[PDB]
Scaffold this motif. Structure first.
Motif, PDB file in Angstrom:
ATOM      1  N   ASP A  22      69.962 120.540  46.431  1.00 45.33           N
ATOM      2  CA  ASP A  22      70.179 120.900  45.032  1.00 45.33           C
ATOM      3  C   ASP A  22      70.550 122.376  44.989  1.00 45.33           C
ATOM      4  O   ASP A  22      69.692 123.243  45.194  1.00 45.33           O
ATOM      5  CB  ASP A  22      68.944 120.631  44.170  1.00 45.33           C
ATOM      6  N   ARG A  28      68.906 129.636  41.985  1.00 46.43           N
ATOM      7  CA  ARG A  28      68.085 130.359  41.018  1.00 46.43           C
ATOM      8  C   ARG A  28      66.906 131.055  41.693  1.00 46.43           C
ATOM      9  O   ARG A  28      66.537 132.181  41.307  1.00 46.43           O
ATOM     10  CB  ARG A  28      67.604 129.406  39.915  1.00 46.43           C
TER      11      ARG A  28
ATOM     12  N   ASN B  25      61.787 125.714  47.711  1.00 50.82           N
ATOM     13  CA  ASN B  25      62.647 126.371  46.739  1.00 50.82           C
ATOM     14  C   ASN B  25      62.540 125.733  45.362  1.00 50.82           C
ATOM     15  O   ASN B  25      62.573 126.434  44.353  1.00 50.82           O
ATOM     16  CB  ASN B  25      64.084 126.377  47.247  1.00 50.82           C
ATOM     17  N   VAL B  26      62.417 124.407  45.286  1.00 47.26           N
ATOM     18  CA  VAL B  26      62.233 123.805  43.968  1.00 47.26           C
ATOM     19  C   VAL B  26      60.897 124.223  43.375  1.00 47.26           C
ATOM     20  O   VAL B  26      60.809 124.578  42.191  1.00 47.26           O
ATOM     21  CB  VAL B  26      62.347 122.278  44.042  1.00 47.26           C
ATOM     22  N   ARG B  28      59.085 126.903  43.909  1.00 42.53           N
ATOM     23  CA  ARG B  28      59.042 128.296  43.476  1.00 42.53           C
ATOM     24  C   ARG B  28      59.850 128.511  42.198  1.00 42.53           C
ATOM     25  O   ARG B  28      59.440 129.294  41.320  1.00 42.53           O
ATOM     26  CB  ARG B  28      59.536 129.216  44.601  1.00 42.53           C
ATOM     27  N   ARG B  29      61.014 127.862  42.096  1.00 38.61           N
ATOM     28  CA  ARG B  29      61.810 127.924  40.875  1.00 38.61           C
ATOM     29  C   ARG B  29      61.017 127.382  39.689  1.00 38.61           C
ATOM     30  O   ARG B  29      60.930 128.024  38.638  1.00 38.61           O
ATOM     31  CB  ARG B  29      63.129 127.153  41.072  1.00 38.61           C
ATOM     32  N   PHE B  30      60.430 126.199  39.843  1.00 42.65           N
ATOM     33  CA  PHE B  30      59.686 125.590  38.743  1.00 42.65           C
ATOM     34  C   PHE B  30      58.474 126.436  38.364  1.00 42.65           C
ATOM     35  O   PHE B  30      58.122 126.540  37.178  1.00 42.65           O
ATOM     36  CB  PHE B  30      59.257 124.170  39.137  1.00 42.65           C
ATOM     37  N   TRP B  32      58.033 129.700  38.457  1.00 42.95           N
ATOM     38  CA  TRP B  32      58.444 130.839  37.644  1.00 42.95           C
ATOM     39  C   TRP B  32      59.001 130.391  36.298  1.00 42.95           C
ATOM     40  O   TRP B  32      58.714 131.011  35.256  1.00 42.95           O
ATOM     41  CB  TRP B  32      59.487 131.648  38.429  1.00 42.95           C
ATOM     42  N   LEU B 177      50.171 132.496  36.739  1.00 41.16           N
ATOM     43  CA  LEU B 177      51.133 132.330  35.659  1.00 41.16           C
ATOM     44  C   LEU B 177      50.630 131.302  34.650  1.00 41.16           C
ATOM     45  O   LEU B 177      49.970 130.320  35.003  1.00 41.16           O
ATOM     46  CB  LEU B 177      52.489 131.872  36.211  1.00 41.16           C
ATOM     47  N   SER B 279      65.145 132.445  31.413  1.00 40.75           N
ATOM     48  CA  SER B 279      66.242 131.503  31.620  1.00 40.75           C
ATOM     49  C   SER B 279      67.288 132.030  32.588  1.00 40.75           C
ATOM     50  O   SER B 279      67.768 131.292  33.459  1.00 40.75           O
ATOM     51  CB  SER B 279      66.912 131.161  30.293  1.00 40.75           C
ATOM     52  N   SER B 280      67.674 133.293  32.438  1.00 43.09           N
ATOM     53  CA  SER B 280      68.767 133.834  33.236  1.00 43.09           C
ATOM     54  C   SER B 280      68.290 134.573  34.481  1.00 43.09           C
ATOM     55  O   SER B 280      69.120 135.135  35.211  1.00 43.09           O
ATOM     56  CB  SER B 280      69.621 134.762  32.366  1.00 43.09           C
ATOM     57  N   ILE B 281      66.985 134.577  34.744  1.00 43.80           N
ATOM     58  CA  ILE B 281      66.431 135.213  35.932  1.00 43.80           C
ATOM     59  C   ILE B 281      65.600 134.211  36.729  1.00 43.80           C
ATOM     60  O   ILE B 281      64.527 134.543  37.245  1.00 43.80           O
ATOM     61  CB  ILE B 281      65.613 136.465  35.573  1.00 43.80           C
ATOM     62  N   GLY B 282      66.121 132.997  36.873  1.00 48.61           N
ATOM     63  CA  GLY B 282      65.564 132.010  37.775  1.00 48.61           C
ATOM     64  C   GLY B 282      64.903 130.838  37.088  1.00 48.61           C
ATOM     65  O   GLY B 282      64.591 129.852  37.762  1.00 48.61           O
ATOM     66  N   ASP B 285      67.231 126.847  31.416  1.00 49.89           N
ATOM     67  CA  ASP B 285      68.070 126.997  30.237  1.00 49.89           C
ATOM     68  C   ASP B 285      67.699 125.938  29.212  1.00 49.89           C
ATOM     69  O   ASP B 285      67.152 124.886  29.544  1.00 49.89           O
ATOM     70  CB  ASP B 285      69.556 126.854  30.583  1.00 49.89           C
ATOM     71  N   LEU B 337      67.525 119.930  34.969  1.00 49.79           N
ATOM     72  CA  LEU B 337      66.723 120.734  35.886  1.00 49.79           C
ATOM     73  C   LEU B 337      67.450 121.061  37.181  1.00 49.79           C
ATOM     74  O   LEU B 337      67.055 121.997  37.883  1.00 49.79           O
ATOM     75  CB  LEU B 337      65.433 119.986  36.231  1.00 49.79           C
ATOM     76  N   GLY B 338      68.474 120.295  37.521  1.00 49.36           N
ATOM     77  CA  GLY B 338      69.146 120.443  38.800  1.00 49.36           C
ATOM     78  C   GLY B 338      70.648 120.323  38.665  1.00 49.36           C
ATOM     79  O   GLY B 338      71.186 120.460  37.566  1.00 49.36           O
ATOM     80  N   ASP B 339      71.333 120.042  39.782  1.00 46.50           N
ATOM     81  CA  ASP B 339      72.795 119.970  39.788  1.00 46.50           C
ATOM     82  C   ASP B 339      73.338 118.882  38.864  1.00 46.50           C
ATOM     83  O   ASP B 339      74.390 119.062  38.237  1.00 46.50           O
ATOM     84  CB  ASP B 339      73.299 119.706  41.211  1.00 46.50           C
TER      85      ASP B 339
END
Ligand SMILES: O=C1CCCC(O)=C1C(=O)c1nc(Cl)c(Cl)c(NCc2ccc(Cl)cc2)c1Cl
Ligand SMILES: O=C1CCCC(O)=C1C(=O)c1nc(Cl)c(Cl)c(NCc2ccc(Cl)cc2)c1Cl
Ligand SMILES: [Co+2]
Ligand SMILES: [Co+2]
Lengths: 381, 381
Positions: A22, A28, B25-26, B28-30, B32, B177, B279-282, B285, B337-339
């Motif tokens: 992905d 991101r 990676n998923v 850590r993205r989720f 944040w 968080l 939204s725009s820092i990891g 949207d 959430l993804g591609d």
């Protein structure tokens, strides 16, 4: 000694492409963790029914993240009618790569004068072809040859904005993060056997051995004419007490591949402050710091280059320091970027060798192998 | 009408498991993007040679992210000697799922009194078995049946900390968080045909139809006895002017699967402020906001529940509001959430139906289909 034997004109590192499951989530994560801006895209919203590709930039550094869509979206296309923006992309190759190796670098891309010539000369000199030269909108030529494992060396040449068919990201979606990273300094491969790997790559590029100067590895560094494209390669050293981390890599990666990317910072202290602030909130973790022994011995080795304040600042951030006969290297390593103990990142800054700064100023940290060791004599302290 | 027909004792939603290519990676993205803490892990560092699994928590909400390692690491194991912490995991199934569907939900897990009984009763009543009951360290029982597509309904029961073999994450690696998200409210599937999907699921669970009240879909909602487990299902409506977004989902997902997760917030305004900051820092949207028409008509519909200040605050954040005969629903949707244009998240808060709050208070937003439309009469304004 620099024989300047490049068999074709090489400019600089151009981009690094990760093959992902992905692309959105990896891109991101990396954007926040490394302070790179979203700068270009090629995906369904740009008419690409084949792959999703997102470009992150920081200074001159370009990271590309690509993942395949369902093949069904493009099942009616043929190569002449493809909507892929990267014509070398193949669904099966990408899924095979990711299932075999996990998240990692597929392409090390360098800009050249003429990608068609570089491809032809490379293959004439032993390079295994991976993707033939293709001219994109009469403006950009891209070609690929095998580098090691399933990593390709990608040639890109421009007649005269990343690639045709990529769109610039709207400013609202493009936050101007910046932690000080500016360019790719070197890209390092792990292989089972160093000798055959060097002979192959130096054979088709004309890159020369960049001069260096019993824990884990043997390595050597291949360099372009101006030594701005730097490609170290490691092999494991077997039979040691501590198992070679190169061998661990090869086992978890299912063979040879890219081990680390070293990213030059214009201010490694700021970069590390910013990256470490974000380690536990989505960014990147760093390897354990060396003991205060190490920093208590840095004054005797680089006390003429770094002030007492700047060396203590190194100890706060866990920065390593090495020195050769031309310059000084500040360096630090992340933990692995993904699930597997394979690829990681190095942040570096080089001081000295001013003429512009010549490539590889200060080396690659070889003296830190002995010095770290030495420093771990604190268990008896 | 609630016949309370559950064929076995169901408690609450327990966790949601995403199958990933790279869990790190998923996750850590989720973490944040949604403000969820890293709370547990099962991976190489805990002795799991099979899969990497990372648990994120916010209040009662549990998101699990799992990816396979190279099969070579565990090629000598058999099921009796497995080091996997989730015994239903299979390398081939996980790679097949991800290559087919992209990043998405594999398991909707509910806690039950007795997972072995729930499995047996389910299959006796038509459930397609996916993974038989297995008792983990004489403490936890887990079983899986097919729900729709390649999504499973996972039963978990505890004799008396997530799962055995998972380790609590060290506090240094566990940043607290919190953007206000507290629990999973509902989990929604998209299917080609609603009727057969409902008959199947209601057939083996005894879940009953939760009462609702021409753009895209038909839906229905299945609910447990206390209506705290809520499972809406959508089918496309074909032949419309605007192509059904359910059909688009089915095409890009390669068939049926989980469409959205609705996450209850204790303070949807704070949650949306915090999520939109990132939204725009990891982070994530959000779908385009409805026109100010929509908010200029909210006073006439919910002006007795929200103050003028709180309704304008809705317009800042793009929040949608609906009302049934029992309560009011505040809701907003992320972009995918993804591609792929497949799975997305809904953030919600419910007001009313106090006795504790009864499940589904305010419905699922069905009135917003007509109201959004109505509101887009601004092009003539
Ligand atoms: O080793 C070489 C030789 C080739 C040129 C080159 O560029 C490097 C380095 O950059 C380097 N130098 C030093 Cl001194 C150390 Cl200690 C290193 N590894 C630590 C490390 C190990 C595992 C993980 Cl997961 C993370 C970090 C590295 Cl990789
Ligand atoms: O639709 C239903 C019926 C079943 C119960 C249920 O829980 C829902 C909703 O929650 C819901 N309600 C509303 Cl009013 C809208 Cl407009 C919705 N979709 C907008 C949307 C579309 C595409 C993308 Cl990519 C993102 C967002 C949703 Cl999904
Ligand atoms: Co290096
Ligand atoms: Co919903």
């Amino acid at each position: 000694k620099n024989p300047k034997s490049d068999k074709f004109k090489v400019k600089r590192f151009h981009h690094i492409e990760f093959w992902c499951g992905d692309a959105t989530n990896v891109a991101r994560r990396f954007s926040w963790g490394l302070g790179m801006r979203f700068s270009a895209k090629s995906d369904l919203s740009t008419g690409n029914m084949v792959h999703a590709s997102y470009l992150l930039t920081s200074g001159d550094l370009r990271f590309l993240f690509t993942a395949p869509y369902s093949p069904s979206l493009s099942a009616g296309e043929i190569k002449p009618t493809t909507t892929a923006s990267i014509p070398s992309f193949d669904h099966g190759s990408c899924r095979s790569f990711f299932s075999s190796h996990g998240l990692g670098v597929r392409a090390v891309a360098i800009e050249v004068e003429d990608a068609e010539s570089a491809f032809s000369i490379s293959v004439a000199n032993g390079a295994i072809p991976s993707s033939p030269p293709i001219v994109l909108n009469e403006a950009v030529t891209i070609a690929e040859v095998k580098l090691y494992g399933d990593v390709v060396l990608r040639y890109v040449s421009y007649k005269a904005e990343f690639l045709p068919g990529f769109e610039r990201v709207e400013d609202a979606s493009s936050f101007p993060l910046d932690y000080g990273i500016r360019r790719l300094d070197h890209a390092v491969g792990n292989v089972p056997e160093l000798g055959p790997a060097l002979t192959y790559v130096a054979g088709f590029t004309g890159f020369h051995q960049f001069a260096e100067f019993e824990s884990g590895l043997n390595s050597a560094v291949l360099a372009s004419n101006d030594e701005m494209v730097l490609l170290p390669i490691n092999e494991p050293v077997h039979g040691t007490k501590r198992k070679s981390q190169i061998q661990t890599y090869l086992e978890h990666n299912e063979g040879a591949g890219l081990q680390h990317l070293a990213l030059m910072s214009e201010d490694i202290f700021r970069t590390l402050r910013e990256m470490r602030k974000r380690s536990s909130i989505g960014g990147f973790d760093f390897m354990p710091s060396p003991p205060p022994t190490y920093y208590q011995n840095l004054k005797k080795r680089v006390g003429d280059v770094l002030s007492d304040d700047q060396i203590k600042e190194c100890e706060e951030l866990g920065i390593l320091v090495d020195r050769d006969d031309q310059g000084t290297l500040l360096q630090i390593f992340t933990k692995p970027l993904g699930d597997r103990p394979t690829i990681f990142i190095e942040i570096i800054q080089r001081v000295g060798c001013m003429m512009y700064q010549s490539g590889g100023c200060g080396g690659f940290g070889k003296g830190n192998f002995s010095e770290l060791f030495k420093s771990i004599e604190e268990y008896e302290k």
